[PDB]
Amino acid sequence: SGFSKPLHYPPVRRDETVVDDYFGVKVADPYRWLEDPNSEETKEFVDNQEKLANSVLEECELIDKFKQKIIDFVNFPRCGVPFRRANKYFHFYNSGLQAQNVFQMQDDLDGKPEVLYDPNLREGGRSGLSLYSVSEDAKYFAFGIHSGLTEWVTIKILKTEDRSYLPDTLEWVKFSPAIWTHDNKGFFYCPYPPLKEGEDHMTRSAVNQEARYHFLGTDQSEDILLWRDLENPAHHLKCQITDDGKYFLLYILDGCDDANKVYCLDLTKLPNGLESFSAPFMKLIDSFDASYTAIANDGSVFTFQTNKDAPRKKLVRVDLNNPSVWTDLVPESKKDLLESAHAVNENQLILRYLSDVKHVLEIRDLESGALQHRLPIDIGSVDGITARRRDSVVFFKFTSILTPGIVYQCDLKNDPTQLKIFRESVVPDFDRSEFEVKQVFVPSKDGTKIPIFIAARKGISLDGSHPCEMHGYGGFGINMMPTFSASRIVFLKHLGGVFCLANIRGGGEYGEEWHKAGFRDKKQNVFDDFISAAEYLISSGYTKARRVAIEGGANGGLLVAACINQRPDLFGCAEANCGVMDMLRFHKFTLGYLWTGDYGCSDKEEEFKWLIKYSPIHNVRRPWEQPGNEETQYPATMILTADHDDRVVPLHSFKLLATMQHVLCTSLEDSPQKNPIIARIQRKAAHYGRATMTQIAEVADRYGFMAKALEAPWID
């Protein structure tokens, strides 16, 4: 059976004086001290919770069996999508179990690879490459490494001919690319201001993002300033250069929304190069009314993707010399989201549509916009189209729940109809034919139909006997696709599991209307959709309440925590990874203020009223005290986080853990809460980008805990 040994919950201090006023409503915050990650009391907390977690995970006898089977199932070579610069080709490679992917160069696609950068030779591959950019002549490679334990990036540059490093070093980058000019003299990038003497990446909320240009062979102090906005510190940036080299495009965003400005700088009409310097941008779009991404241009005639009066998106054309006259090229589809578009083979477009959460590729003529070919893709995901306008061969990656990884090739000149296999990964000693994935559409509370994928062994009986894992996210316009996971295969084969992915609202799957129906005032819809999916899996006979586990990361960790506060009776196991748990204070830490588009903010009265109803740490309540459900407790719960997660600060997880342990376990002398409530805190790690073995160790612990919580035996 499951968990039988009682837990020795450690003492955690409460400061009872901390109370905040939100428009007349008082909120006590007695674990305010856990907001300091560098203090001695917080480090002791982490030590005590590690100790408790170890004794619980010692009781979970299947961890070692999961660990070895995950290692074995992921031990296959993985070739990335290749891209071209001049007469060279570039790609990422992993031979199967390397700590981080290696970046390689070739003369031809079937030639001998040459290693350009191997992260495994630095600190055992603790961290990998988060930025990688090759110049137009293929002579230089700009690459981003992690100098500390947070996700902050340092940019270095090497010569491709001998791999010699240039001395140039650029600090203070997060998500920016490095965008080369066609003269090969430098690149655009978008850094934040430096850390001052006292400051720490874990406790500073960085603002005032900048657009800069770096000349090769200079110090970072010489980099040219192109844009800054001191009166709007929260406005953040992306950038791009056009295929012809003529225009630098700066996109300006406010919060998480899919709405951006478009500023264009004509590089061919500068008196003194970029050394002339804000710069004289043409402000094509100067408000936050719609999304705009540049796809192609012929001189000043541009082709944009946009959601302007088009929640499923479309393609439109405009002349910069006549800026107010926009004309449709490919109208909005009546059914399907236009997810992305790419110019190829000089005068053609590849369009990627999402049609009931399955991709469809259309080949079109660029000038007229007319359909030429249509290729439906199987259950799974196409992405990573990086080919540029001048290329006649397009590459992209395909993944699915039962398909580890194919790089496809579409030669547009020689045969544009079908797709050829360039590279194909294979899972060792795994018979794919014994399993299936199906889509079903389930009604939510309000009637809205929610697509879900269900993966399982073929021919199982729908008798309620199977353990079930359900995954979801529901936020920021993100599309959740059924991709490959090795640990999920172990769950299906060796634990007899049923996996479900739920395409709940707040994602982008049916366009901007789907996103808006699960954000701000309607965030509760997201939780209702997830709860309804679990109720369908029960009523249709896949599983029952004791046997359902739910998992999610970040905004998906919020999802899990809210669902266990509201319907603890439905679940047997809950796993929240790096979740946003204090919805009253999230906006104050690091770059959490960028989530106010989706969540709202407690600075405003009507928005506070949304947030207080579902904020995880403010809604922990003993389920057995509600008349009628005296035999209900919280499911076995694992809260996962990392000590240098600067994306979602670990105070979110620390404060929830302490509140749950207090309210449900240590505040009562003989609690009905028997199921364990623990944290697994990864030392010396950030949000993402961890070494292969470090991530395998976390995932084996999750699944061993799940197996115990659900009372699922191993199957050989």
């Binding site: 920021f476 996971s485 991530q695």
Partner: peptide
């Protein structure tokens, strides 16, 4: 977008 409460060249599809 890159800047969200979201977990995404990962070393392995674990």
């Amino acid at each position: 977008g890159v800047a969200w409460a979201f977990q995404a060249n990962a070393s392995a599809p674990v």
